[PDB]
Amino acid sequence: SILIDKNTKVICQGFTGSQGTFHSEQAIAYGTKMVGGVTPGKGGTTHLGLPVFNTVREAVAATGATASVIYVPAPFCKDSILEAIDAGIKLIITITEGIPTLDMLTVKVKLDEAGVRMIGPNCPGVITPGECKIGIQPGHIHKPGKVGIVSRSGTLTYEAVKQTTDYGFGQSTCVGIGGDPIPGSNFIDILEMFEKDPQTEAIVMIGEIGGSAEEEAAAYIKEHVTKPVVGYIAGVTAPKGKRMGHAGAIIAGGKGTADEKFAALEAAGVKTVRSLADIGEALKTV
Amino acid sequence: SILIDKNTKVICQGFTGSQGTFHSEQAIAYGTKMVGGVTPGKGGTTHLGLPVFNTVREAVAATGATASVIYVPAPFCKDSILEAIDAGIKLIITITEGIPTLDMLTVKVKLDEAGVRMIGPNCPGVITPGECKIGIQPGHIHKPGKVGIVSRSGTLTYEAVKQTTDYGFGQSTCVGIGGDPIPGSNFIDILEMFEKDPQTEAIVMIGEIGGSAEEEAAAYIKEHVTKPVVGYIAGVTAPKGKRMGHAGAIIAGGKGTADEKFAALEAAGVKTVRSLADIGEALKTV
Amino acid sequence: MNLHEYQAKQLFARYGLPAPVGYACTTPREAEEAASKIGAGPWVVKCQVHAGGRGKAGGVKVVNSKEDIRAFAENWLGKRLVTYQTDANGQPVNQILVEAATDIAKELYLGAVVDRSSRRVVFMASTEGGVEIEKVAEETPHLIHKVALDPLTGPMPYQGRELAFKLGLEGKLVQQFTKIFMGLATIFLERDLALIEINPLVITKQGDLICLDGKLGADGNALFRQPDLREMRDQSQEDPREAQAAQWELNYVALDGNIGCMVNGAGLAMGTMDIVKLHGGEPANFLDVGGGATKERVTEAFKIILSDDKVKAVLVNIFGGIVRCDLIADGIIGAVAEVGVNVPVVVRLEGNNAELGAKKLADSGLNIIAAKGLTDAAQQVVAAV
Amino acid sequence: MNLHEYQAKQLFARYGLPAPVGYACTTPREAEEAASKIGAGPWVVKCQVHAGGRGKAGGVKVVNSKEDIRAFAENWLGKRLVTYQTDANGQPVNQILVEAATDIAKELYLGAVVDRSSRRVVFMASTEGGVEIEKVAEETPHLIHKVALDPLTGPMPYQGRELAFKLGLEGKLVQQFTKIFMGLATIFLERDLALIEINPLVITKQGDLICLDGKLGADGNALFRQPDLREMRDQSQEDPREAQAAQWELNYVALDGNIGCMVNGAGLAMGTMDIVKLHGGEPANFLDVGGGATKERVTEAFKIILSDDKVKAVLVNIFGGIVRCDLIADGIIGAVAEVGVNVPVVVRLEGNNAELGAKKLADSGLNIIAAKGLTDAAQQVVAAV
Numbered sequence A, B: 001s002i003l004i005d006k007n008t009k010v011i012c013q014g015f016t017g018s019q020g021t022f023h024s025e026q027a028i029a030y031g032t033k034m035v036g037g038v039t040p041g042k043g044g045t046t047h048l049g050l051p052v053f054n055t056v057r058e059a060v061a062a063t064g065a066t067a068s069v070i071y072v073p074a075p076f077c078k079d080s081i082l083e084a085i086d087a088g089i090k091l092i093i094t095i096t097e098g099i100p101t102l103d104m105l106t107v108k109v110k111l112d113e114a115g116v117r118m119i120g121p122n123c124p125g126v127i128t129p130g131e132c133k134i135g136i137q138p139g140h141i142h143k144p145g146k147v148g149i150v151s152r153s154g155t156l157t158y159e160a161v162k163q164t165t166d167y168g169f170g171q172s173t174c175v176g177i178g179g180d181p182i183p184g185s186n187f188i189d190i191l192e193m194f195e196k197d198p199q200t201e202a203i204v205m206i207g208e209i210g211g212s213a214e215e216e217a218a219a220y221i222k223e224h225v226t227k228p229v230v231g232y233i234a235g236v237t238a239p240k241g242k243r244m245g246h247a248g249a250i251i252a253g254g255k256g257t258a259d260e261k262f263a264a265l266e267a268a269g270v271k272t273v274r275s276l277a278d279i280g281e282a283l284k285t286v
Numbered sequence C, D: 001m002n003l004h005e006y007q008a009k010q011l012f013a014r015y016g017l018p019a020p021v022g023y024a025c026t027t028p029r030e031a032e033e034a035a036s037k038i039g040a041g042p043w044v045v046k047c048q049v050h051a052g053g054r055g056k057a058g059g060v061k062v063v064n065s066k067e068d069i070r071a072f073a074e075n076w077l078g079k080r081l082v083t084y085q086t087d088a089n090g091q092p093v094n095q096i097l098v099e100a101a102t103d104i105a106k107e108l109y110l111g112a113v114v115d116r117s118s119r120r121v122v123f124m125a126s127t128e129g130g131v132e133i134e135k136v137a138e139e140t141p142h143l144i145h146k147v148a149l150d151p152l153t154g155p156m157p158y159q160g161r162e163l164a165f166k167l168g169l170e171g172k173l174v175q176q177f178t179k180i181f182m183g184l185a186t187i188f189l190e191r192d193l194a195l196i197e198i199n200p201l202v203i204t205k206q207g208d209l210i211c212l213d214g215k216l217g218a219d220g221n222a223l224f225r226q227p228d229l230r231e232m233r234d235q236s237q238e239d240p241r242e243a244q245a246a247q248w249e250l251n252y253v254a255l256d257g258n259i260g261c262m263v264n265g266a267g268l269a270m271g272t273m274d275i276v277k278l279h280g281g282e283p284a285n286f287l288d289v290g291g292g293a294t295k296e297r298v299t300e301a302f303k304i305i306l307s308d309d310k311v312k313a314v315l316v317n318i319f320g321g322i323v324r325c326d327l328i329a330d331g332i333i334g335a336v337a338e339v340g341v342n343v344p345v346v347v348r349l350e351g352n353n354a355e356l357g358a359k360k361l362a363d364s365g366l367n368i369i370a371a372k373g374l375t376d377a378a379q380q381v382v383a384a385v
Ligand SMILES: *SCCNC(=O)CCNC(=O)[C@H](O)C(C)(C)COP(=O)(O)OP(=O)(O)OC[C@H]1O[C@@H](n2cnc3c(N)ncnc32)[C@H](O)[C@@H]1OP(=O)(O)O
Pocket: A013, A014, A015, A016, A017, A018, A019, A020, A038, A039, A040, A070, A071, A072, A073, A074, A076, A079, A080, A095, A096, A097, A098, A122, A123, A124, A136, C032, C033, C034, C036, C066
């Protein structure tokens, strides 16, 4: 179990909005400890039976929450991923899609320098079966287990989740790091949190075209990962120089193809599965 | 005979250009008294055997010319129509098409205040058969006669010219006032020059949709035109709110249709011909 | 050239004129999100088409919830809207404007154009806001006040105050109205416009002036010196061929009849269409052949006239020009056999070699008729239908 | 989003970077007239398409007479140009740039992008001008120098000099090169750009630096705060459907195979296409269904996938989502109807009521196959071809 658990208290920014409401209502029912939300100009009211504040600080005082999930429109996202960091929140989850690349670029630098953690932005999600859920995903395909999963694609995770529920195994905790080109925490940052964790026996790493955090994770694995890893890369049929949905799923000037990622992920001592059907089948071999 | 004659000396601005050359070469063969041209930066040379100057003033000195024909690109037209006026030329003919409406609007005001005359802009033309030609038209369909013609369309003139050549009559002098919405001289200004002229026995006035100088001419005719007039209006089948080729041939908010022009041109005591085929036939009746 | 509502309001903002707060939107989601960046309800969602009378066609509604905004955007993006100012087809809605609802106290009309007649830029104001000025003009002309801009001095305050007064405003509503007058007047001269129409120019309950809708027209002849405007043209609102024809120096316009015309010169072009209507035919278009009938130019000219299935005959009519009337016939023939022309073609030439050119067409053996003069060519095409 | 050559040179002029003198032209005549406003010959005429390698495709010629310019414009306006960076179709030439010929002494390369790897904006310079940087990169990597913009301080003059020096410039050519560096760098951060590429950055015989060509890429995500740029997009260069699909929150891309895919989520979408290639089929496109498969959204999704004649089967694959897998089947059926789908459709559902939704499709009596899981649905469509 990593990142969160039944004891993690959470506040949500942009709590009074459509997606904010709908997705909180769910985390409320799965039993996540949502303690209240923030929406400037509406402080001093109640929403889903929880309290609503004007600032991220007013909240972190009155509740002592340590993680925040953001459902705020791109144009203002940078301003609240930052207000969070200032009121000293230690775990930031940002759903929002469409944040300007140069905004993230600046934001990341602050994120490291102040020692804070953000997962996302652009449809991420983090769930520890039975205990906690912050994200947009369906909770009934999961079963408390022993496998860890990191993935850029959100939906590809659902496929790998179910295969491991169906083969008994179970998931320790699931991390979707988001599709943008410059994420708040990448593979290596999450791969390490697993290794050092007991509840997790093996790892499923899901990547796709564009960039090189897949490659880099490889190198870091041969050298510092003791547990076993099963990997899957999406996007072989994909054309060059076109963006396939995800802001960061593009092959720029020949770098970051499907194949290299597989290749270099192999010579690292990982078991590559070429059809996301045999994911379960490959885990059986451990 | 009005505006010009075998004794009118002419200089052409934008004399060294494509259209400038081609069209001068013609006026030079029809025997028009072209005495030289102007092109900034090329003064001190010879072109079609005539002398080329740097400024319109250097020209008007060295030649004593009193009319200038302009073949200069829209973007700079206003600047030379103006330069002409300042070196005191008294008759300006501007072929150029595409001069910004607000440019003409200002230019017209100067043209009145200083007492100068401009015919055009946008494909006009002035020819007195046998004697003079400044314009782009073909000289062999004309025959020295007794009819005067004013028209907004250039090509419609050619039709009316030939009909009057074929019925013996002849043309005194032909004036095409141009198609733009704000011309340098309109119908009334030219209608008067005829009346006061001996060589011209009757008049053919050719108009078209858009504006109201046709209407106004009417009123001025009943009241101050003694000679007889045959009129033709083009554009009945024309749609509302679309510009038909000519910058000023457009029906804006229901004003200036084909019909009203005919109508109000009738009750003025003019003989309206509904098919530009019966133009000659109608002149026969005088 | 015409401009969109949102582009005008955007230009207004730069010169400091007041407009409501809003955002241009290309997707349901963007529109939906705009609600909160704006403020509290309600909001006005408007289709962005060049034509007017959107109001009476259900293209402008006031809504109250985030999802009513969505719903609206889904129902219009990607579809054509037909007002009483468009043709059976309508114009394509590609953007939704979502702006704040304004408290309306009284609707005025403010506008301006170039008066060919008096040769000045003229501004008109009226108490009759929210309606076709044209109606008020013929029906109640005494309710439309005007002032004319002096080209020696540019706009001046007193003119602004003057209208302001005939409109019966008083107090601060006058200073404001003058500000707007001097503003629009400036934009008019600076951006080389051909027309302006703020209708309705509203007076809020709170007692302020504010532009609720804008129609801007720019002078095509001046685009070379208005680069910013050059970029705002939206080809999707005009007939694709109109533009396709300009690339080849051809002035095209579609009507709805069965006989096509290809004539050289705008006067002769309108003249011809009229003489075809005169003998019972319906001209199907107006096409002016600009720079001499070269082989290629004529071709494209056909290519275009014939993209209309309703055509059943084509009338060519060339007089003068810069081409030997024989190379024109040469081109016409080539043009026909290469495009694959079905209908009957009636050429009418006049000028040089004009009578051998006619022969070259009668010998050709295709379906081409050399007409003897104007009144003939007329009846001949009218006949072949 | 991409920008045209002339638009980039226009932006360059605003920040004071040097570019040759030229004018954007939309008609033969306009181009022709430009010759003289420019100066004495010769002149360079260039097609304005988004892609590059126009040089080797005969899209950029140096000419010497007013009519050679005309000729060129008549030959390209209105036609598609195909370089080695476009597809069989090519991109439509709607404007010609006509600018002054520059005396070339030596061609350099200057460019910049966002390095996902080191997380910084990076500028690259090289002595190898006039050629694909990608080649020089894999073939002679020690010839491409770089510097990285610090996000705490913005660009700094020394960085500009360091490159300037590794390039072996000296004297005033350094000050100039630094000016350009600080400029492009500023434009990069201010207009929210994603990429820049001045190739070739020339050194005139007269010893001055000058930008001869520019490729600009803007960050789509930021258009809401770069209104000026929002206006410069030219839909005519991209696949019309791509845009037509965005209006309905659908991400589309055309490939060239025979099996269509409609999947929800970009990952699963790429995942699926790969598993169809795995069993001998050719995916014909990538289509991600954004906001839940409502009846309408699915329809348009088909409407689009099927506008391609090459398709001979469609593979739907929905997992999870915000819709009860039964209303999805309901919509799929209703979609197959309204559209008039002739090929075989293979649905694959997973989630709620997934059980009965499948039945509702087997009962429907159309050509629809409820597959049992992933590896099945695969073979089933691969089979029906
Ligand atoms: S990832 C799953 C699939 N989704 C996608 O691919 C699309 C992801 N969607 C987005 O990225 C949208 O940008 C999100 C952020 C989800 C927003 O959509 P909503 O429709 O929920 O947005 P609303 O406008 O309805 O609500 C937003 C609320 O946020 C408040 N707000 C503004 N500024 C702030 C700051 N700085 N801090 C906190 N809250 C803030 C708005 O006022 C609004 O609340 P209201 O109740 O509407 O006033």
